[PDB]
Amino acid sequence: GSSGSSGMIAAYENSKWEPVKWENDMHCAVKIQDKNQWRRGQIIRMVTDTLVEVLLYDVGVELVVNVDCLRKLEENLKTMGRLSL
Incomplete structure (x- = not known):
């Protein structure tokens, strides 16, 4: 047991919005209101x-x-745990 590693929501939540220019065909994480889960989206x-x-x-x-x-997709979050390109 004792399984629980909150990195995405944790980092994001703790962090605060930042002034960044969103470009087409980009990856990011959106914060839902009614819900408390961070979902990933693609700059349409x-x-x-x-x-x-x-x-x-x-x-x-x-x-x-x-x-x-909206929030920038942090690399760390992308590769949580075992790092390997």
Whole structure:
């Protein structure tokens, strides 16, 4: 037992939004409101200076969230545990 390693939500949650330019065909993590789980999305198309269209390829749902909830996909989070390129 004793299995529980919160890195994504942990790091993200603890961290705070940051001013970054979102480009097409990019990876990032969006923060849900009604829920407390960080989902990954793909920069589909920038709508406004605050809104951005992303794709939850992870699950398979096309939607658009606010850059205020968006977060840069940290490398560490990408490779949690065993590191190997």
